[PDB]
Ligand binder design. Structure first.
Ligand SMILES: C[C@@H](NC(NCC(O)O)Nc1ccc(CN)cc1)c1ccccc1
Lengths: 219, 219
């Protein structure tokens, strides 16, 4: 059905900056009635989406003037002539022309700051936990920027994908930074079969991972 | 003022049916479609369907036919969505929205969590350096707050340590159970010289667990 491709998935801006979000629907959105049901929403964290612009270019009541939309055929743009704090969130285009109504994947409008590398901290399973037959290895990757980060776990130098649960905070209100934990969960027995436990963070600020590591036998 | 008031959070056994309500006030209810939309982390906004109260005209997103049922009572001004055969894939926030040409007003959303689990207080595991390291000038500590149900929990560090040095990692639902963590960073001039404690409130089990952070091994 109607795929709505929004780029970019992430728009860092400084407040006051202009912002442009593209929405490329996979077909024209002109209804038989001649209207074009291309709309734009914002959802802020903790909140429900809200309509911003309906039928390509009309601003829904109460929507700030700095918001305008344009486009036609398969290219539609939301524009925020000057990004203000209140405008931060996930913007979604949407076509209401064809059933089923669809939405773009979202564009997260957030604050741009200087690239920052993660402070990586790795912790072995606690004795409290191991006592119960579980073993969670935790890696905090704190206060980095941009949001994009890739974390690789290695157990004795071989990558481990399974067991890994990653959780990002949302953008820090104070430093515009992101954090994430990555938890590698094993049985005590899996855990106890190996020595070298490595959390590797790949991020923009680095042409090679931040590697954080422990050996079970030194811990 | 157009308001759509949804029913409260649902905790549902797999296989159960839930019926979400949506109370529409501020306008003429049988004049507008009510849309139902699904939002599930990492799945953007997925339309489920619509119903036109009074006329019972519905549209359903294809793969929701057989799963979602919409009903609307023009007398109560309430629309309802039933979802039957609940599985972990249906764990999401559901929205009703007023629809006509866009989805111009949304409900606050209804969160549905599917889970077999009994109310489980979290196991709380300290995350402190060990492994024979020397601390830098700052030390990152944490608590891994594992296997609870339901949401949510509150991690608080020495009561007022969100000074702010704290990262709370949103909880992730994994096999009907939750795990979150929380990091804190303090100068090592302060730790372990002084007491750092994570206090983990799990209201839903009338459970609070304080865990003193101590070196997990030689430092
Ligand atoms: C009035 C509205 N009709 C309608 N359903 C009719 C039906 O399928 O039986 N609902 C509808 C359409 C789009 C949206 C949008 N984002 C919300 C509700 C509509 C009709 C014709 C063109 C465009 C919109």
């Amino acid at each position: 059905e109607l795929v709505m491709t929004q780029s970019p998935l992430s728009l860092p801006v400084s407040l006051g900056d202009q912002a442009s979000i593209s929405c490329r629907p996979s077909q024209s959105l002109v209804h038989s009635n001649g209207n074009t049901y291309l709309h734009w929403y914002l959802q802020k964290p903790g909140q429900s989406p809200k309509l911003l612009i309906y039928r390509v270019s009309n601003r829904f009541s109460g929507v700030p003037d700095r918001f305008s939309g344009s486009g036609s055929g398969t290219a539609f743009t939301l524009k925020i002539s000057r990004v203000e704090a209140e405008d931060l969130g996930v913007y979604f285009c949407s076509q209401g022309t064809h059933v089923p109504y669809t939405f773009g994947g979202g564009t997260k409008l957030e604050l741009k700051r200087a690239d920052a590398a993660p402070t990586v901290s790795i912790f072995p399973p606690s004795s409290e936990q191991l006592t119960s037959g579980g073993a969670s290895v935790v890696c905090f990757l704190n206060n980095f920027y941009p949001k994009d980060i890739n974390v690789k776990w290695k157990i004795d130098g071989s990558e481990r994908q399974n067991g890994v649960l990653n959780s990002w905070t949302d953008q820090d209100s104070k430093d515009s930074t992101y954090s994430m934990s990555s938890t590698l969960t094993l049985t005590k027995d899996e855990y106890e079969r190996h020595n070298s436990y490595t959390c590797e963070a790949t991020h923009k600020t680095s042409t090679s991972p931040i590697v954080k590591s422990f050996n079970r036998n030194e811990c | 003022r157009v308001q759509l008031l949804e029913s409260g959070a649902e905790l549902m056994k797999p296989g159960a049916s839930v019926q979400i309500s949506c109370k529409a006030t501020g306008y003429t209810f049988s004049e507008y479609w009510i849309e139902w939309v699904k939002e599930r982390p990492g799945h953007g906004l997925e339309w489920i369907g619509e119903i036109l109260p009074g006329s019972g005209r519905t549209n359903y997103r294809e793969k929701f036919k057989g799963k979602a049922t919409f009903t609307a009572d023009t007398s109560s001004n309430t629309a309802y969505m039933q979802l039957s055969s609940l599985t972990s894939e249906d764990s999401a926030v559901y929205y009703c929205t007023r629809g006509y040409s866009s989805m111009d007003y949304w409900g606050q959303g209804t969160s549905v969590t599917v889970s077999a689990a009994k109310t489980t207080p979290p196991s709380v595991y300290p995350l402190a350096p060990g492994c024979g390291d020397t601390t830098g000038s700052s030390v990152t500590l944490g608590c891994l707050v594992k296997g609870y149900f339901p949401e949510s929990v509150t991690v608080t560090w020495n009561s007022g340590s969100l000074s702010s040095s704290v990262h709370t990692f949103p909880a992730l639902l994994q096999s009907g159970l939750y795990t979150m963590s929380s990091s804190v960073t303090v100068p090592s001039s302060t730790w372990p010289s002084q007491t750092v404690t994570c206090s983990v409130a799990h209201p839903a089990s009338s459970t609070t667990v304080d865990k003193k952070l101590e070196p997990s091994g030689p430092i």
